[PDB]
Amino acid sequence: ELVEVLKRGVQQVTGHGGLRGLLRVFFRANDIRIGTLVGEDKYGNKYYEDNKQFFGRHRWVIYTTEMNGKNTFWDVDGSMVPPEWHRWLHCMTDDP
Amino acid sequence: NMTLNFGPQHPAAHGVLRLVLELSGEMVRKCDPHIGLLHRGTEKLIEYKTYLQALPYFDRLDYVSMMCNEQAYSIAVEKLLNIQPPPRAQWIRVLFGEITRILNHIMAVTTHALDIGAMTPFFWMFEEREKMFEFYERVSGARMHAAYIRPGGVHQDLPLGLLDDIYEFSKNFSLRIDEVEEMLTNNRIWRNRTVDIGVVTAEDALNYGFSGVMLRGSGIQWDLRKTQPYDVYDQVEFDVPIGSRGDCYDRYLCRVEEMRQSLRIIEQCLNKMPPGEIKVDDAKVSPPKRAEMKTSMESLIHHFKLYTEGYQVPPGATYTAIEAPKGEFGVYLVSDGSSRPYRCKIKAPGFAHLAGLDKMSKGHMLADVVAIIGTQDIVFGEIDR
Amino acid sequence: TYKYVNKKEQESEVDMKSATDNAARILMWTELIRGLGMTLSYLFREPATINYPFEKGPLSPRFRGEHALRRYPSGEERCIACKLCEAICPAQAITIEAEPRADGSRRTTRYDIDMTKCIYCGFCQEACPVDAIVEGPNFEFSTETHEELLYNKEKLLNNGDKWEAEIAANIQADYLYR
Amino acid sequence: RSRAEYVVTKLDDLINWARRSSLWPMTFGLACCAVEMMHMAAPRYDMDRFGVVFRASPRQADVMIVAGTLTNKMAPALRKVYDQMPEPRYVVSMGSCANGGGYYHYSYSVVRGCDRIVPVDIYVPGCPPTAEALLYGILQLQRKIKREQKLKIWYRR
Amino acid sequence: SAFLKNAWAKEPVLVVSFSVWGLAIIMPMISPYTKYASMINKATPYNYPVPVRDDGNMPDVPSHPQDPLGPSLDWLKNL
Amino acid sequence: MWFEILPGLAIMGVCLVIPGVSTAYIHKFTNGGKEKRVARVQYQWYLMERDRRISGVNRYYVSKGLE
Amino acid sequence: MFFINILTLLVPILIAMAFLTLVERKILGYMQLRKGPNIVGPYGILQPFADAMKLFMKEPMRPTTSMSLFIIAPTLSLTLALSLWVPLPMPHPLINLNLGILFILATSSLSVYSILWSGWASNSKYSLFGALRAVAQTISYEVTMAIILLSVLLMNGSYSLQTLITTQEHMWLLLPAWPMAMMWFISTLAETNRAPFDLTEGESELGFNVEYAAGPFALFFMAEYTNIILMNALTTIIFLGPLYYINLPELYSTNFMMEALLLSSTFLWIRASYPRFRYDQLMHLLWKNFLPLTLALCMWHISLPIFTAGVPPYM
Amino acid sequence: ASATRVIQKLRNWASGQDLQAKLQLRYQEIAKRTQPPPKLPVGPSHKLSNNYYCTR
Amino acid sequence: MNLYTVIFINILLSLTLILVAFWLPQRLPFSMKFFLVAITFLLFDLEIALLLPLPWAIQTIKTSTMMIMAFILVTILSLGLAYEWTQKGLEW
Numbered sequence A: 001e002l003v004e005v006l007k008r009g010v011q012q013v014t015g016h017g018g019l020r021g022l023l024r025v026f027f028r029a030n031d032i033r034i035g036t037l038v039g040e041d042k043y044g045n046k047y048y049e050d051n052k053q054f055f056g057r058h059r060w061v062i063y064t065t066e067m068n069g070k071n072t073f074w075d076v077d078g079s080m081v082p083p084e085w086h087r088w089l090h091c092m093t094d095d096p
Numbered sequence B: 001n002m003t004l005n006f007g008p009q010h011p012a013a014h015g016v017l018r019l020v021l022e023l024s025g026e027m028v029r030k031c032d033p034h035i036g037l038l039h040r041g042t043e044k045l046i047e048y049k050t051y052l053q054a055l056p057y058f059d060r061l062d063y064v065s066m067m068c069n070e071q072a073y074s075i076a077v078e079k080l081l082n083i084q085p086p087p088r089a090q091w092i093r094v095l096f097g098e099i100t101r102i103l104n105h106i107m108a109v110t111t112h113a114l115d116i117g118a119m120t121p122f123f124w125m126f127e128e129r130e131k132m133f134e135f136y137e138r139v140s141g142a143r144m145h146a147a148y149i150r151p152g153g154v155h156q157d158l159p160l161g162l163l164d165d166i167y168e169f170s171k172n173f174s175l176r177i178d179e180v181e182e183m184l185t186n187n188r189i190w191r192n193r194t195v196d197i198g199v200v201t202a203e204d205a206l207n208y209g210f211s212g213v214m215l216r217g218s219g220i221q222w223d224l225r226k227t228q229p230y231d232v233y234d235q236v237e238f239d240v241p242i243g244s245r246g247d248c249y250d251r252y253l254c255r256v257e258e259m260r261q262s263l264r265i266i267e268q269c270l271n272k273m274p275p276g277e278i279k280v281d282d283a284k285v286s287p288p289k290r291a292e293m294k295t296s297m298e299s300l301i302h303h304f305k306l307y308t309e310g311y312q313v314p315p316g317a318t319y320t321a322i323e324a325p326k327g328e329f330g331v332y333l334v335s336d337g338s339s340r341p342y343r344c345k346i347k348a349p350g351f352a353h354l355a356g357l358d359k360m361s362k363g364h365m366l367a368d369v370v371a372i373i374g375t376q377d378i379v380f381g382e383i384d385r
Numbered sequence C: 001t002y003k004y005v006n007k008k009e010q011e012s013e014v015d016m017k018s019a020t021d022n023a024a025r026i027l028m029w030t031e032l033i034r035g036l037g038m039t040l041s042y043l044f045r046e047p048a049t050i051n052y053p054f055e056k057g058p059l060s061p062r063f064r065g066e067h068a069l070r071r072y073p074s075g076e077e078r079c080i081a082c083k084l085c086e087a088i089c090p091a092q093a094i095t096i097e098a099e100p101r102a103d104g105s106r107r108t109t110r111y112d113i114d115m116t117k118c119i120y121c122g123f124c125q126e127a128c129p130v131d132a133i134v135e136g137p138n139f140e141f142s143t144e145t146h147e148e149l150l151y152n153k154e155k156l157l158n159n160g161d162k163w164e165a166e167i168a169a170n171i172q173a174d175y176l177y178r
Numbered sequence D: 001r002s003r004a005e006y007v008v009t010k011l012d013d014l015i016n017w018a019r020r021s022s023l024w025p026m027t028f029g030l031a032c033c034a035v036e037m038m039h040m041a042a043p044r045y046d047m048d049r050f051g052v053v054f055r056a057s058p059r060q061a062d063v064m065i066v067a068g069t070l071t072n073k074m075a076p077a078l079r080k081v082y083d084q085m086p087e088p089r090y091v092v093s094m095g096s097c098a099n100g101g102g103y104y105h106y107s108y109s110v111v112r113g114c115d116r117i118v119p120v121d122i123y124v125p126g127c128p129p130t131a132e133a134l135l136y137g138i139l140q141l142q143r144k145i146k147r148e149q150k151l152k153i154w155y156r157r
Numbered sequence E: 001s002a003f004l005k006n007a008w009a010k011e012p013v014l015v016v017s018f019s020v021w022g023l024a025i026i027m028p029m030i031s032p033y034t035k036y037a038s039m040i041n042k043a044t045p046y047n048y049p050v051p052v053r054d055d056g057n058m059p060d061v062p063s064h065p066q067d068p069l070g071p072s073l074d075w076l077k078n079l
Numbered sequence F: 001m002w003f004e005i006l007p008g009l010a011i012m013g014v015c016l017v018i019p020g021v022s023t024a025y026i027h028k029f030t031n032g033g034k035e036k037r038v039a040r041v042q043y044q045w046y047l048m049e050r051d052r053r054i055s056g057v058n059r060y061y062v063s064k065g066l067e
Numbered sequence G: 001m002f003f004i005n006i007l008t009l010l011v012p013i014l015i016a017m018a019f020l021t022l023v024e025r026k027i028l029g030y031m032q033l034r035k036g037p038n039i040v041g042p043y044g045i046l047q048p049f050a051d052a053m054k055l056f057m058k059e060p061m062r063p064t065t066s067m068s069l070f071i072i073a074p075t076l077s078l079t080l081a082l083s084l085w086v087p088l089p090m091p092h093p094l095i096n097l098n099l100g101i102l103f104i105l106a107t108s109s110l111s112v113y114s115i116l117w118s119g120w121a122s123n124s125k126y127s128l129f130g131a132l133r134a135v136a137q138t139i140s141y142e143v144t145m146a147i148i149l150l151s152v153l154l155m156n157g158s159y160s161l162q163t164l165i166t167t168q169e170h171m172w173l174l175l176p177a178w179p180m181a182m183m184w185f186i187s188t189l190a191e192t193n194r195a196p197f198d199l200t201e202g203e204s205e206l207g208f209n210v211e212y213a214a215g216p217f218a219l220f221f222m223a224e225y226t227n228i229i230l231m232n233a234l235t236t237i238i239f240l241g242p243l244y245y246i247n248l249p250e251l252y253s254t255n256f257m258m259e260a261l262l263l264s265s266t267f268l269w270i271r272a273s274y275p276r277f278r279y280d281q282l283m284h285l286l287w288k289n290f291l292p293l294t295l296a297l298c299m300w301h302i303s304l305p306i307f308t309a310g311v312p313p314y315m
Numbered sequence H: 001a002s003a004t005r006v007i008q009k010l011r012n013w014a015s016g017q018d019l020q021a022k023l024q025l026r027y028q029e030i031a032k033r034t035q036p037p038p039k040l041p042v043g044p045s046h047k048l049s050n051n052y053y054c055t056r
Numbered sequence I: 001m002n003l004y005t006v007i008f009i010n011i012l013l014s015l016t017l018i019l020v021a022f023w024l025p026q027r028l029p030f031s032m033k034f035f036l037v038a039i040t041f042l043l044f045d046l047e048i049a050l051l052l053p054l055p056w057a058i059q060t061i062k063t064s065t066m067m068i069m070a071f072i073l074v075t076i077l078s079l080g081l082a083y084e085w086t087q088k089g090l091e092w
């Protein structure tokens, strides 16, 4: 029971790389959740999908560190996602 | 009775309402609502636009009931042309007509509570609303302000798969209405602030032209959808939720009951929607399919003329009224033989309801006025037009 | 068919048991406690919100979003300046003036969509015979200055080139319907 | 690092972060764009998460979202409410009705833009500008608020 | 009586309100302990008990606190 | 999920126990390991004062049978 | 030392006061199907500090006014609320006062002025009315609030809050006197102008914050929330008596921590769950529904002691 | 969903309803995107005969 | 003194805030009902006073007189309330 939830929690925390990775995700994406990388675009954005979660949150993008020169560590904006991968993120097309 | 000019204080909102009032302490002596803070010219602008380019104005007239309004202009333009929409389109309009009623009632009941002070019902049902918007978007392209119901039927057939989802949602929405209930229908406190506030007699409601739940709440039985059927609302079976001891609480109960009855109408529409076309086949009134206009000369000519010039409705005038979620929404569309209308007075269920604010909120406290603006579902777009 | 809401069918005469049940309802706020239970229940439900930058609310192919002008695969801009996109625009947003290009082809010297004037009806998407003007998927084009929102042919053509891959996929999915 | 310049860059970074993290939105709820934000306040796209509170009285209000047409009868008011907001204040114009006249541009009763009445910081486009689209616009205000360097300008002034 | 009934079901606070008013106006009158309050509080010794001279004409007064004479609070004990 | 509300509650709680443990150990330090005498009524202040005079100046120091 | 004991008992409460707003903006959230503020900082822990810095930096508009009330009032609200934590007997109190509950009742009563002064100080006739609502209700609810305590005291024997730790060594005073707990809880909801009874800041503008922005807004603001805790804490000493062991004083404070947080959670839960009462609906409750119940149950608490030979031991 | 049974039981009870059966959040029940291509039906008036407009 | 020390810190903390707050940034509303309430309030507030010594008076040796007195006070005021209800008072 409760142990299971704690267990999956550990998986999540330990999942995003070392503590460095967790902090990278914890502080800029504000979500420690692990999914399956569905691809990495040439800009650097990494896209993931967790079909187990609800429709709203089964597909997420972890934006890059630098796009077109600008640092995007903290100043992440949606448009960073490339037009090709925009529809996958918005569920316009179910195909990566 | 020190005029307080309340309402530019964003206190009941529903738009921007300067309800100049004279209050002896906390009692309201007279309410003179001011209007036109949202007049925008919708009636004059339409005279300078063609029939199809005036369709988007109707969605904006009262945009919480985005489509139901479009159906009223549609019907009106179809009558003037003596054209009727194809069978599938009719069911669609009733399908999205009802979905829209729910959307309006979720707005009216939850926004009513937010002004009263209950805030959790709004978040509970705005999530359901959201899910509905998505139907609009996947059918029209826009979350709200679709332009889907056009004067000759719907614009494009439903996506391949929508019906199934308008089912999953409907299959569950009930529980969501049930929840709101366990929070407000019997709250020991909702009742007090709502019960016996703004009672309107039956004779007075007809006299001031209320024509909506406001009449139905007073016990007058009138649903233009049963009395004068439009589209295929005749082929469905629903129960009008009439009320007694008409007051803010009773009418509310009526709006929760039409949310319930609309799920009964939606179910049917999903169960019995016919195979067919979604727009009249008269290229004269409905634009030709894009494969046809790109391969057949008569279709291009009809596409070019329809988009550039227009329907060219035969000269005449009609007042067609539907049962928009707020109440009777009617368009009096006078039309010369030209492709652009001559007049289009929009009857707004709301111009009449506000007027009643004075005869409803008499000897009432400041908080009572807030409750009554809620029980009239005033969307300043329709009133101001 | 009608239905009475809030109409008491009959006068149940008070029975002590009934009275107690009622009095208890007023004295020990029983129904108020009922309402608290409902909210405690959701507190335990999963929240429906989405990380906005990381996750995006789903939009299907017909979403109108932001205007773009497409080009043929060869590289010839699709618009042939028939100018009925201007005719059917409800808001008077699109302004088009044209002249025969040197090639001899018909093309628009100036195509200006005033997005602040545009009400995103999507009729222009509908009206175009060559389907040169399309409602592109992007909805995030908020701009610091009003002038940026006014769009000339070069911005729209550039918008078209950037989003052509998704626009083509979206039109591919919905053309049978139209 | 050690330099009166570095201390003045870091401290505004602090002042900018506070204003950026907590923007209380004052929503002139004109027309329908107010609904497309009531959807932002709602659960699919919470705004509070981002520190933007659901509703604050004008006096307490860092941003003003002008949703809907600004008629020539509400203009004299918008300016009043903008003028009565606390100094640090920002305006976000939502809707083609507000940023420009939109449908109703040529009307005799509609101001062709709120920019004519109140200085506008971010213009969010779309007839019902989508709710993410407003959320992107509010996030763009946060990017504009991060870039501001008021303390640096006072130091080298 | 009938109103009483509805009163029990409508405006059911006053009923309870008055009922208590009375029950507090009765229990004191009829109770096996009411008397103790004036005693238990009387007994509680707050001010020093000054001793009287021994004229030797008093058998009632105990010559020593622990003597078998004088007042007792065994009533307080085992109360 | 609700557990995210916990971080905030924890910080509140830790910040509501500090005060009760703090006041109740800055007393047992200043008063020599013995709870600060509560002098509700004069008698107690007298006894307390008497204690001061009995030893050092502070009442907490407490002389015993060996004095 | 005593100074250190003033930092503790103040800062700790101020830091906790900040974390209540956060646990309010998240518990209300999850109840309404939304995460609440988690993006600033980790899980929103830095969120309370963020808005504090924004509020102080914004222009204290000082909107045209009577100036020394636009400044004195906010200060009184924070001063009285933080002051009332001075005698709370978390385990040992800080300043043990023989007539402690009268101190708490009197200090609360003084806060009604801040509402009156702020309402007069703004120059909006609207505000003048809004303050009236709060000032009137405050004194009104104060009348049952005080009588409910007098019933308690008579079963405690003294006005000192420290005595109740010895009165409640075997059973909470909820078991007995539960009927008043409820009536103390509802009155605690009114006196902190929380939801069910939050007419102030109501339709006026959804009263005495109308003209208050930035630093003044914050101080009352802080005051309200500290009160929100204090009154809940008084419920957790007077009616829910945390277990006290003389050998280890902190399990008293540990349980005081647990009960205070849960009852503080309850008024958060009440707010989201109920619509706000009407102005007269609110006074109708106190003068009609509660005051007759309280005055009669007050007499029952002068009788229960005597005929049950249970007169409480003074001291 | 994805809720430990106990939380679900508390949920169902506090609400008084089997909220699990009808969850608001959508999970793999919503119509998949890229539903198959649609061949829509052509209505009347597309006959190539006896279709004179004057008669319609 | 100990209280004085605490209180002045309390005012100092608040005056500090307002000062920084102002330094870091660099006609006839009358209803007898309202007056009537205030009055009633004191009539009740005074009574609260005559009822406050009851904790010390519980220990009074008399007891009978104590309760006889206290019950009379509570009853006569409540009747005052009763007439307030009966009259338009308390009916706003």
Ligand code: SF4
Binding pocket: C078, C079, C080, C081, C082, C083, C084, C085, C086, C096, C127, C128, C129, C130, C131, C132, C133
């Ligand atoms: S319609 Fe299509 S092609 Fe004709 S002008 Fe407008 S855009 Fe260019």
Ligand code: SF4
Binding pocket: B060, C119, D030, D031, D032, D033, D067, D068, D069, D094, D095, D096, D097, D098, D102, D103, D126, D127, D128, D129
């Ligand atoms: S912009 Fe489009 S949506 Fe926003 S108000 Fe004007 S019309 Fe309504």
